[PDB]
Paper text:
For the A3AR–mGsi–[name]–Piclidenoson complex, we achieved a global resolution of 2.5 Å. Following local refinement, the receptor map achieved a resolution of 3.3 Å. Piclidenson, an A3AR-selective agonist, is a larger molecule than adenosine and extends from the orthosteric site out towards ECL2 and TMs 4–6. Piclidenson differs from adenosine by two key substituents: a methylcarboxamide group extending from the C5’ position and an N6-iodobenzyl group. The methylcarboxamide group forms a hydrogen bond with T943.36, with the methyl group extending into a hydrophobic pocket composed of residues L913.33, H953.37, S1815.42, I1865.47, and W2436.48. The N6-iodobenzyl group occupies a hydrophobic pocket formed by TMs 5–7 and ECL2, making various hydrophobic interactions. Notably, the iodine atom points towards the backbone carbonyl of M17245.56 in an orientation (θ1 = 121°, θ2 = 96°) and distance (3.4 Å) that favours a halogen bond interaction. In the Piclidenoson-bound structure, M1745.35 is pushed back towards TM6 by ~2–3 Å compared to adenosine- and LUF7602-bound structures and to M5.35 in structures of the A1AR, A2AAR, and A2BAR. Our Piclidenoson-bound structure revealed that this N6-iodobenzyl group occupies what can be described as a cryptic pocket, a binding site that only becomes accessible through conformational changes, in this case through the movement of the conserved gatekeeper residue M1745.35. Our study employed two different G protein constructs: a dominant negative Gi1 for the adenosine-bound structure and a mini-Gsi chimera for the Piclidenoson-bound structure.
Adenosine receptors (ARs: A1AR, A2AAR, A2BAR, and A3AR) are crucial therapeutic targets; however, developing selective, efficacious drugs for them remains a significant challenge. In this regard, the human A3AR is enigmatic because it plays dual roles under different pathophysiological conditions. Here, we present high-resolution cryo-electron microscopy (cryo-EM) structures of the human A3AR in three distinct functional states: bound to the endogenous agonist adenosine, the clinically relevant agonist Piclidenoson, and the covalent antagonist LUF7602. These structures, complemented by mutagenesis and pharmacological studies, reveal an A3AR activation mechanism that involves an extensive hydrogen bond network from the extracellular surface down to the orthosteric binding site.
Numbering used by the authors:
A (entry chain R): 9 to 207, 226 to 293
B (entry chain A): 6 to 52, 165 to 213, 224 to 354
C (entry chain N): 1 to 128
D (entry chain B): 2 to 340
E (entry chain G): 8 to 62
Amino acid sequence: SLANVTYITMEIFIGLCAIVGNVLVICVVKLNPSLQTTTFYFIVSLALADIAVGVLVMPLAIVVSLGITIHFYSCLFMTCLLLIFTHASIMSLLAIAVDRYLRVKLTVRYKRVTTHRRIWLALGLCWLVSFLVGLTPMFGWNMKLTSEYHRNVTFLSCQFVSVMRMDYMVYFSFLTWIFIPLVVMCAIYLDIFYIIRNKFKTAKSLFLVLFLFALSWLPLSIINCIIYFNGEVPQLVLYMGILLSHANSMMNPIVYAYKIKKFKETY
Amino acid sequence: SAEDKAAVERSKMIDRNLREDGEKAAREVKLLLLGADNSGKSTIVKQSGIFETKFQVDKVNFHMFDVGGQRDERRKWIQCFNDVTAIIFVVDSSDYNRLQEALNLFKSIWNNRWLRTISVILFLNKQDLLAEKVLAGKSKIEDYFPEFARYTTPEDATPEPGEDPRVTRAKYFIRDEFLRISTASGDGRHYCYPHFTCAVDTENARRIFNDVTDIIIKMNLRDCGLF
Amino acid sequence: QVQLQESGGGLVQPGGSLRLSCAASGFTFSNYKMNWVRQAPGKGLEWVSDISQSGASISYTGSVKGRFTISRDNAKNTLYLQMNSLKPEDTAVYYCARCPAPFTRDCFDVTSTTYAYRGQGTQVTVSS
Amino acid sequence: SELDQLRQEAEQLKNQIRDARKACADATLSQITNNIDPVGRIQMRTRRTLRGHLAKIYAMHWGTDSRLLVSASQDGKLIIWDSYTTNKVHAIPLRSSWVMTCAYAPSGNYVACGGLDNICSIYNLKTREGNVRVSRELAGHTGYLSCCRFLDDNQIVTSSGDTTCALWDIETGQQTTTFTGHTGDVMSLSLAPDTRLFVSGACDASAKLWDVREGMCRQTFTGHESDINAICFFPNGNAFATGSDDATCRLFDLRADQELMTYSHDNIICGITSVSFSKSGRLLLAGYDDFNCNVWDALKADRAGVLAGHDNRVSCLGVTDDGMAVATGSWDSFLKIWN
Amino acid sequence: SIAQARKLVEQLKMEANIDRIKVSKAAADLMAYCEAHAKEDPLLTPVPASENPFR
Ligand SMILES: CNC(=O)[C@H]1O[C@@H](n2cnc3c(NCc4cccc(I)c4)ncnc32)[C@H](O)[C@@H]1O
């Protein structure tokens, strides 16, 4: 369990950095009323998801790695909570990208149609879709339906492999909810780049937000695609993928909030 | 607490109307119209106290504020226009004697601490009068601007069809005089949009719309950190 | 009491030289950009030159470039204007105008008719 | 000839006034108030944040009940706040959104506003129909109206950008008295507690003491270097403080006819938009362009504290009649109540 | 301009003929006013939260 000890001790480091960094985001936005703008509602929604990664996903990523003998549905709800608050971070990043697309495409009409009412519905729909993506295994995409062996299994050791299905993780969790937003985010951030050029310091900003999404969500997703095609993956490179998936929630204030001048001035 | 509840209900009703009026106010684009008496700023769009001109381009309502009825000293009342989307600066480009006065006024507006976040839509008006003054040859820019003798027309210039090279060199020199000021201070916070316009020009409202669109896009991108 | 006192103006032959002095009092001279403005007979007020607070940023109007040399002495609180190669169109009442606010790159209203931080002026007459 | 003679006579009179002031300046306010104990660290905190204005606030005036205040923001709204409960009592739509000043009548029945429209608009808050309507528009100023203060329900002194202050009769809408003499445009006015006098600060770096009834300028106070944006009368009426763009606040005494104290620091390079005294006059609260309000010990020239809670330019500052609160409006579209 | 200068001279004559007290006397009066009203200055001496309407 030498790699498992290093994995747990690094999840805490990623998790504590995630919580501390993203609480300071919601504080600045709440302590300065001028930063309660249309821009920071997506940042606050992102920050709430990233805090949820630190407090509800990071401790539960440890519990799914220790293999404690709990009920299948108790383990399923713990693993489902790993996918709710991590897909909420992904949809919040899509929400920022769509919001940044409306600044370049709606032009003068941006601050007229995107009222506070329709952003709360948009951010609420994102969080609602985040829950409905994460609560899909609780509605019969669990491993119980794969075979007739898993129907009668109660009080198994809580591992991700034994409870979650790779059909959901490859086709629903990555190809519908991580790859399609990434294609949209790449499409948004390539269209934004061609408008700022038609009218180096702008390519750097647009690539960073896009590369760190890909650096954090593609390594874990490629691993899940290898094991779905009968391949094999080492456990240490796997743990790094899980660490990279929770590292997005830590690098989000520095890449999204800190680039904003009004935020960086107070911090 | 019977009257206290009514006060909160009245305050919520009042705050509701402020939100409604703020949304209506947000649909209007506030512009500051500035220029000398000979600038022809009153005939730019062609649509007492401070005079307001309302024009709409592509369902976007622009409120152009021409501040008449004030004295020649403007260092205090121009601070009232800190939050306007653009300052529409109109220059009589033909009047060489008052070009430096326009340049000094543009320099003051550009470098003012309450106007340094405001992009300026520059209108180099009276291009028809500027063209006939250059071709006549009686009035020389080099008498008022010795650097015009060493000035060459930029490769990025877009001369009008059938325009004399002397006229093109003259009008772009005046543009570069204002653009020298604009590039010297205000690093990416605000930009200058120069336009060569005449008295009979009918596309100035479109030009303001195109620049204001660029300003608001850059303002929105600056808020999210992208610009 | 902000007081600007011009001196050195007078009758000068065309092509002659004339040095103006602006004694400044009532304000910290080194904190303000200083201006020279004209009053030609029958013409409006024309800005001639400015010098920055330190004295590095110096700009002249094009009619006097190569001929006028503005300078300041913050120690003596004096604003100078060396007017060489004087032409008859330079016949004007020359006022030293102080920019209204300290530590400001902008200089508003120094050419206004009733500007406050501007001296009474000195008469420079360039005639044969 | 005649003009040069008049200028030389004016210089001789100015030297005579300067010599009289120097003869009366045996000691300074620093010397007299050297032995008094310092006020300590005045740490006021934001008790109420009034968040209804959707544009920069240019001015705010307190009511004499010390509970209701009128705020003028450049969105065309005069909001009257119940500062104890943050309730908006009124929201008056303005014909001209470029409002630069607002006044609150001592009776509380009326408010005023003005700005680039060159018109002081008087609004009746006690209409029989129950809705606030404009009662009188005061036209006659040929420049932007920078400040206004009610003496009563029928008289109001309005200072404007036409370099003149005017005493109005609201019932007739006419200037009963015009106060001329400022060469630069007047930016603020401060009524004396007995309302027989008012001091006006202008952009000519001079503050003039006016007699309301007589209509003449009794005393002219120089000493500032730049445009006097703010003026406020000491609670006894024998002195007043000014705020200017030269990053200094100066206290002028009427009966000494000269500056007593300069409230400045080397790290302050921003102009003063608003000044206001406390009830005892010991604290001089001044709003600055560095987004902060420095509380000044008026007797010892020591920065007692900083009211740092605004993200944009502090344009107005008001202390209640009972001294219980300090309202600081600003260009961040928020009013903050401090004590 | 002659009328403007003449009006300035007449105003300066009015301002030069005013009875000015010493700066020491004025300073003493201001200091006495501050010390006589310091107890009733809430900003100077903070009031208890019970009597403060903004607590
Ligand atoms: C989109 N939200 C996520 O990816 C989160 O869900 C968890 N998460 C994903 N993928 C995992 C995994 N994949 C190996 C594997 C091996 C065999 C079968 C199966 I099903 C899976 N292992 C353990 N936690 C995994 C991580 O916490 C992420 O932050």
